[PDB]
Structures are given as structure tokens and as C-alpha cells.
Design an enzyme around this catalytic site. Structure first.
Site, PDB file in Angstrom:
ATOM      1  N   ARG A   1       0.813  -1.221   0.000  1.00 19.22           N
ATOM      2  CA  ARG A   1       0.000   0.000   0.000  1.00 19.22           C
ATOM      3  C   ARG A   1       0.849   1.276   0.000  1.00 19.22           C
ATOM      4  NH1 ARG A   1      -2.613  -0.528   5.257  1.00 19.22           N
ATOM      5  NH2 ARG A   1      -3.886   1.306   4.722  1.00 19.22           N
TER       6      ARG A   1
ATOM      7  N   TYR B   1      -9.893  14.721  -4.226  1.00 25.39           N
ATOM      8  CA  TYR B   1     -10.335  15.774  -3.331  1.00 25.39           C
ATOM      9  C   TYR B   1      -9.461  15.836  -2.097  1.00 25.39           C
ATOM     10  CZ  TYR B   1     -12.778  12.109  -0.575  1.00 25.39           C
ATOM     11  OH  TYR B   1     -13.115  10.994   0.164  1.00 25.39           O
TER      12      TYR B   1
ATOM     13  N   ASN C   1      -9.540  18.032   5.367  1.00 25.68           N
ATOM     14  CA  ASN C   1      -8.975  18.249   6.697  1.00 25.68           C
ATOM     15  C   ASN C   1      -9.877  17.516   7.677  1.00 25.68           C
ATOM     16  OD1 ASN C   1      -7.086  20.252   5.798  1.00 25.68           O
ATOM     17  ND2 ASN C   1      -8.656  21.851   6.010  1.00 25.68           N
TER      18      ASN C   1
ATOM     19  N   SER D   1     -17.192  11.297   9.276  1.00 26.45           N
ATOM     20  CA  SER D   1     -17.349  12.236   8.165  1.00 26.45           C
ATOM     21  C   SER D   1     -18.355  13.338   8.489  1.00 26.45           C
ATOM     22  CB  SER D   1     -17.787  11.499   6.895  1.00 26.45           C
ATOM     23  OG  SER D   1     -16.849  10.501   6.525  1.00 26.45           O
TER      24      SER D   1
END
Lengths: 247, 247, 247, 247, 247
Positions: free
Chosen positions: D129, D143, D146, D221
Site C-alpha cells: 500500500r 479531493y 482536513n 465524516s
């Protein structure tokens, strides 16, 4: 219900901060005669501003501004907007202006405020402050600002007594710099994008750093100050401007 | 459960604020014949707006705007959007517009509002305000604004009764300015970037400063006012515009 | 701890809003042949879009936009992104685009949402909304928006039942606009700068002002609405665009 | 006394997102030979990127970006900043770049994080990865973002165990998309304007919409997500880029 | 009854960050004579800065900056503003600057703060930090920042003792980076748009990522950190700059 206690003010000379960027490549590459022609017209315009000042009809100052925000600040004060529109239009149509680009500006009016009672416009302790003369030396620091109106930090909802207390403390901090930094406060409420314009003058730009940083700890600034961009410029007499322009 | 009590409104003339910047260098350096030709064509266009105003089919005003935000404001009011799009396109295709750059604009519709009891569209103090004519002297102050919807300061969540009391105090504060300041409120809710457009007219720009500053202390403004850019311009008649263009 | 109850969605045609500004000076001063040639090519490109619409394989619309934000809106809907990439790239490669400047744009996908119960894509009351046809007349109102995620006003943290209640109320408010306003909701989450794109179509732009203002009082909008710029345009058929371009 | 529990990270390849706008008018109006010469040079530069990718010394991708934000994305991953500066400078020096304008960019480093337990860089479940290979097909969604630090929603003040639980839920929501969407998280803390750069790769752009929207309901989120602009592009192989340039 | 306890500061060298974008197309396609003349002139200018630094009267650094924000950073430190105004004016009138565009800048003054008592300007642990020397290798990370003044997170309203505790913790986190990262903090209060300018110097840009990310978990940064744009550049000696410009 909420009883408004509007701040009292007195308005003096109108103020125009005219910030412009110099097209260095075009200016320094232009035919010398074209530059001289532009130079003569530019000096002539400034001599007119000087003339108005001597007749007590305003004040002015030209500065070399540090950084990318602007290169030259044309600061003018007059008894009203019309004379400012005049000075601005005449500069804009000058041959020198062909090599300039407007980067920023601010229209405001010298303002003397009082939180609780109206000021005496004829008082010898008030009247002179209405028509400040721009120092012909040193440096200038300009920045616009608003009084915060957010959540629990709402300047405009506070009682006049509290605003008076907050402003008194602020004035006291500023007076520590008496004789070192000159301050001109102008209001742009209903005239421009910010509520006030602030001009600080000093013989050493570090004084701007000292006073602005210290003032930020006063409650009025810490809780209610909303600041815009800060411009620092060095006063240019005719010879200094000539050298700046490579003439 | 929240029950909405939407503000009642009456729509009048559509309004277009067309702010442009003048390319001074190009205009003042252009051949005299080119300038004269552009001038003659511009007069023809403005004459059309004049005739339309005389016929009661709209109104207009052209202003010299201070600062870098715009140089000329072309204000037009019409019974719909189509005539505005036409006036706007006509100006843009004119030879004079080759020396102009669009800097800002605002599309809105004259709005008369009432928080509780609906307004009488036939009242002699309501109907005339739907089709306000632009005064032919003095100055103009334009600024867009929204009603705040942040945390505890959420105008749109308030009961109609509270909004009514808040607006009443606002109207009261502005009553002392009636003699010197005319006001035209237009709504741009689903038409432009801000909810309202505000046009203030006065013979002294300082009146704009006094009223906008004093009003900020009213709870409605202090807690729910969200303000955009402020433009100040001096009304220009035909000769004034000609002089400004150096003709 | 927190159990998410993500909104159910159905995706239909992809949408591209392509806003451009016309260089009036360059276009109207260009030689007639260059203008006619550019127009012939432009007509052909749009004709292709029109043929696709007639085939039921997409939809399009060209509008004259008011203000400085844009002059022409080229709206296209397709089954996917590839033909949209083509639509914008081909317009940009056209001779007409030599006189255009891209001012704004938006990429989204027609979205039909449901807070609790999943929607049936084969339902006669649902399926048609997946492929909306742009009205060949009237006006359009476009604006992007987000659902607020700030402090106590966090839409995404709300239980699905509450979101369903807030949306139902929103639906009831817009019901009286059914016959005068057509609405197309498109999602741009992960596709563009805002979460949704909203297109309103009506034969009268004042309807946009009426619905948007009234809906702002619904709790869903008052507390959770975060709005971007608003664009208003008049639909242009081939002859109207020809006239707009002075041909 | 606050005890910090900083997130553990492993850094892999450095990443550069180079977004540019194509001057369509100038490119398509340019002489055919000049265009071909520019194309041949461009292919040569990209062949170099492909060669180092085959050697395992990096990865790259060129995409046609939808909308006004950008037209072409040149994505490059290298073992350090120097080779990125080289690829960036080489492209800028190319004849093709004379027709390009930089619209956006992002410098970051592939980052593998863990809120509590440190990661083993040699683990077969972690190591690969560190050097992700850009899919040679499909689409990309980029995109920056923060982690929120506002009021009660301050990610950086949370204890590591909370952040761990929040990230775990995020991962569970994403496992559903494992076979359809590939993601590369890069950190730009101290390197660019946002804390992280996020690249999503998929054969269908609608997948970006599905995953981004659903994840917004996860508490991590919903409460702590602060998102920048979203860019979507279609992967272009050599033949596709040639076609895009009209050759 | 808030009693301010303003932070004491010592001012060292004045600092100017002059970020410029290179017009690659214009430079690389310009006649060899033009490029060589510009290079020779630029070298002479930089040599003046170099000699100035050798005489301990200042310091400088030129860097190749990654991304669209800037391409070259001309960093200068002098005993005052005048020498800085001279340095940027001299660069702006150079032939090389004809191929440059100013993209960003920052004017600040090296600052050594102390939350409770005046610092001794003569201490061997203080005096050298007043006139920092720019490393002649490696990389630089520059970013401006403010201390938050929002709601419950108001740095300027905190007691000096608490601010001291917060800063002490910040210093302890940075301890492990001692031999890898050099830091220069400068204040721009009353001088530029942000309160402080921060320069980090290291031989590996990843160190910037490590220290900035880790420090964000310290309470002082998590709750009171307000960060501006981040620029990363590679130090260029005369030879490297020559190669960068294709000479």
C-alpha cells in the site's frame, strides 16, 4: 425588549486609500522620453494635492508598499467625496497610470466615536482630530476591520456602558505609544466592505507590530476584532519616488 | 413540530445593477473620432432608457463609483427580466463597452414585505413603491444582504410575531432618516447570490454612513444582518458623464 | 455507537452545466465571415444534441444568463459522463469558443432520494424522473447546495425518521408550485464542489423568487440549507441565439 | 493536562496532482505541424513516466477532467520530491505546456495511518500500500480534506480510542465498495493547503457518488469531515489523449 | 474585569518571502541573448545578497517551489524594512522578472516570544536566534498562521500562565526534531495578513510532514491553530538555479 444605544460619532475629512501595482516590465522598458513625460505629469498632480493641503483642503501621502498586495499607496483626504472622486479620476487618466493596475482601495470618513454621549464638535480637544494631516516621513500601516457580531461575541448587542468600558481600556493601551505611533480612525459603515479603516503612522514599522500585537490582548480586540488585510508602506517624498521609478 | 409562517411579499419592477470598470489607459489613448463615435452611440442607448422612463415603463441611473470595485454603475428597473437582458446586452455590444470590464452585478425584484398582516397592494403608500423611479441627483449606496441562519441567530426559524417586532424597531430607527435618505429594497432570493439588494439614495454620502451604522445597533441587524460589498456612486447626468469621459 | 441510516438514492441521467461569458467586444467586431462560419459550426453541434434529445437519449438547453456571472448556459443531460466530456470539449474546440470564457460549471447526476423506504426504479411515478427533459421555453434557475454539518444543525447526524419528516414538510410547501415550477435535483457528492445541483424551470422567473423564499422558512432549509450562487437564464431556441449573436 | 496521542503513520511514495487547463482556441488554431511536434514531444515525456513505472520506480496517470476547474490531470507518484519536481518542470518546459495554464495542484505523500497500534512497514498486508499503482483505465476522483477542529467537533483533541472507533466504522462502510473502488490516501500536513489528499479510482464515476454520499453519514465524516474541491477525470491512454488533442 | 497580560517579544531581522511564478513558455522560447543577459544580471543581484550575508548583515535563500502556488521563492532577511523594499524592487526591475509573476509574499520580523517575562537579548540562548542564517541546502516549508479567537477557543483571552503551559508542551513535542528540523518564527502582527510566518528547514521534506502532523495533536495547535497556505521548496545554489532555467 432590546433598547439600542447607538454609538455617537462625528465625521471629518473623507478618505481614499488607492493601492496600485506597478507593471515593472512595461515601465522600465518604456522609451525614456515617455517615462519623463509621465513623470512630469505625475509630479504636477502631486503638487496639486500639496497645494490643496496648504490651503487646508485636505492631506495626502504616497508610499512604497512591501509585498505582492500593492506597490504604491496614494492616500488622499478631502472635505467630501467629490474631491476624492476628482483626485482618483485624474490619477487614473494619467500617463503614469497606464503602467499601473488597481489592486485594492478603501473609501471612508475620519470618525471620532463616543459610546455614551455626543462629542462637542467645537471643542479644541475634538475639532483638530477631524482633519488629520498625513506625516511627510516614516511609514504607514493600513488595515480595515469590523466589530464582531457572532454568537456570544456580539459588539452591537452590548450595552453602551460595556462598550464604553472596553473602548476606554483599548484607548489606554494605544496611549502607551503616544508620540511614537499616530492613529487615524475612519468609518466606512455603508461606504465600503468593512466598518472601519485604520491608519497607523510611525518612524519605525516595528512600532506597528508592537502596538497591534499588544492591542490584541485587550478584550475589545480579542473578543470583538475582525481584521482585514494589513498593508505597510514607506513614505516617499518626490526624490524618493523618482528613485523608485528609476528616473 | 415547527410551523412555518413565511413573510408575505409584493413584487414590483425587476432590477439590474450593472457595475463596470473603465479601461482608462485604452479609452483616453483612443483616437478622438473613436471616442466621439462611442459617445454618440452611448447617448442613443441612454436616450432609449430615458424615453422608456418617460413612458412609465421603467427607470434608470448612471453613476461614477468610488474605488477599485467599479467605476460606473448602470442601474435599470423594468417590468420584467426580458427588458433587462435587452438593456444589458445592448450596453455590452456598444463600442463604449469595448473599454469596459464587468466587475459586479445584481439581479433582483423590488419587494415590499410584511411579517404578519398582508400589505394592501392598492394603498397609496404601498403601490407607488412597487415602481420606484431613480432620483436624478445626489448619490447612491448599494449593498446586498442575507438574513442570518446561524446557531441561535436564525431569522427563518423565528415566529412571525418576533420577526414583526424586530422589523418594527428597524423601521422606527430609519424614520429619522426619511427626510434625507430614500430606500429601495429588492429581493433576489432565487435570483442571485444574496437574498436582498438594498439601494439608498441621498444628497450626502455621509447620510449612508449614519443610517447604516445606527441601524446595526437594532437587534434585527445586530443579530440577523449578513452584509455584502458596499458601493457608493455619484449620479451623473449627460454632461457629467461626458466630462468624466474627457469629452 | 452511532448507527448511520444513509439516504436511499436512485441515479438517472448525468448532468453538465457549462456556463460561459461572451467576449462581446471581440465577437461583434469580428469580420462577418468569421462570425457566420462560427455560427454555422455552433448550430451543427447543437443540432447533434437536439437529435439525441429527439431520440430520447438525452436532453439539452441553451440559455441567456443575466449578470456578470455568466452569459450563456449550455445544459446537457446524458446516460453517462463520457458524452458530457465530449459536449464541453467540442464546444471549447469550436470557433465560437474563441470568443468565450468559461466562468462556472457543475457536474452532477439526476438523483431521486428517499430517507427511509427505498424507491422502486420501475415505478411509473418514479422512473420518468430519472430522465427529465429540459423545457423548450421559459427560464431556468440553477443553484448548487449542501446540507449543513455545523454544531447543532448537523443533517448527516440526524436519524432517518427526522430527515424524512423535514423532507415531507419541504414537499408540502412546494406542492402549490407544481403547475408553474419544474424541479430537477441532481447529486454531486464525490463529483463536484457541492452536494447537490438544483434546476428550477418556469415560464416566469418571479416563480423562482417565490418558491425559494417561501421554502427558506421550512425547517429543512432554515436550519440545514447551505446555498451556492444562483444563476437565472432565459431559454434560447435557435433563432433567439442567432439574434443574441447579432446574426 | 492534555496528553497527546498522535496518529501513527507510514509514508510511501510522494504524490503530485498537476491540474491544467487547455487553451483550446490557441491549440486548435495553431499550425498542424506545431501541434504534431508538441504531441510527439509529449508522448516522449510520458513514455519516460511509463518506463519508470514498469521499473517499479513510480506510477502515473493522465486524465481528461470534467468542468471548468481543470481539463487535464497529470498524476505522478515517485520515491521523493525531487523526481516530482523534475516531472513537473519537464512538463512545464514542453512545447505542449505553452497551450496550458496551471489551475490547481497538490503535493502529498502516500500515508497509511493507525490511531492506536503502530503499523509494520514490512507486513505483506501493509507494505504494498506504500507504493500504489494507478489503474490504467476507468476514472479518478480527487479531493483534499482536513479533519475538523471547530467547537465541540475537534478531531485532534479526541483520545486515540475514540478516533480508532470512528475510523473503524468508516472502514466498515467502505468494505462494501472494495471490488469497485480503489483508494489512495496521502497526507499533505506541512506540505500543502489541506491535511490529506484522497484519490478514488473506479470503472464507473457513479461509484464515487455512492461511496462519498454514504460515508458522509458515518460520524467520522458527518462531524469531522472538512472537504475541498472535487475533481473527476477519465483515464486517457496514449490514443485517447491524442484524440482529445484532435490528432 | 479582564486584565490583559500581553506576550513580551524581542524582534530580530526583518523577513520577506517573495514567491513568484515563472512564465515557462515565455522564458524557454525567448532568444538566447535575452536569457543570458537576464541570467547574468540576476547572478549579480544574488551575489550582492550573498556578500551581504557573508558580512553578517543578513541572509537569503532561493528555492524551487512545488505546485501551482509558486515556482521560485526569494527569501531575504535584513536589519530592517528598507533593505527588503530595495531587494524586492531590484528583483522586480530585473530583466528576469519580466518572465515572472508575483503569486504570494509575506513581510514579517523574526520574533522571540515569552508569555510572562521580558527575554534577555544578550543570553547565548537568545541572541543568535535573532539573526538566523538560512541553510545553504535541503528544503524549506513556509506557512503563515494566527492564534484562534473563536468562542471558547480564544488564545488572546487566556491567562499568560495558561499560554505558557500550552507553549511549553508545544516545545516538548518539537524536541525530538532538534537535529533534523530548524525553525524560524516571525511575527507579522500589524505587518501582513497573518499574525506569524513560520519557516521550517530540513534535508528531508517528510520531516515537515512528521512534525506538523504530530504537533497538531498538541492542545495549543488543536484548539488554537489557524493555518494558512503551505509552500515547500528545494534550496537552489547558483548552479542548480542555472540548470532550472535551462542555461
Amino acid at each position: 425588549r432590546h433598547v439600542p444605544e447607538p454609538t455617537h460619532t462625528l465625521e471629518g475629512w473623507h478618505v481614499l486609500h488607492d493601492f496600485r501595482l506597478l507593471d515593472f516590465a512595461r515601465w522600465f522598458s518604456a522609451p525614456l522620453e515617455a517615462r519623463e513625460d509621465a513623470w512630469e505629469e505625475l509630479k504636477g498632480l502631486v503638487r496639486e494635492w500639496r497645494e490643496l493641503e496648504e490651503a487646508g483642503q485636505g492631506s495626502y501621502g504616497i508610499y512604497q508598499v512591501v509585498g505582492h498586495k500593492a506597490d504604491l499607496l496614494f492616500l488622499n483626504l478631502r472635505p467630501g467625496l467629490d474631491p476624492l472622486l476628482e483626485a482618483e479620476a485624474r490619477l487614473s487618466r494619467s500617463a503614469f497610470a497606464r503602467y499601473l493596475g488597481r489592486s485594492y482601495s478603501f473609501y471612508s470618513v475620519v470618525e471620532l466615536g463616543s459610546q455614551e454621549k455626543p462629542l462637542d464638535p467645537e471643542s479644541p480637544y475634538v475639532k483638530p482630530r477631524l482633519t488629520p494631516r498625513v506625516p511627510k516621513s516614516g511609514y504607514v500601516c493600513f488595515y480595515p476591520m469590523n466589530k464582531r457580531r457572532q454568537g456570544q461575541d456580539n459588539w452591537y448587542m452590548l450595552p453602551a456602558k460595556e462598550r464604553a468600558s472596553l473602548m476606554k481600556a483599548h484607548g489606554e493601551t494605544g496611549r502607551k505609544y503616544q508620540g511614537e505611533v499616530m492613529q487615524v480612525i475612519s468609518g466606512a459603515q455603508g461606504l465600503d466592505d468593512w466598518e472601519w479603516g485604520v491608519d497607523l503612522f510611525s518612524e519605525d514599522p516595528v512600532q506597528f507590530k508592537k502596538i497591534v500585537y499588544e492591542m490584541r490582548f485587550d478584550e475589545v480586540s480579542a473578543r470583538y476584532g475582525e481584521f482585514g488585510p494589513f498593508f505597510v508602506g514607506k513614505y516617499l517624498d518626490e526624490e524618493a519616488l523618482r528613485a523608485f521609478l528609476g528616473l
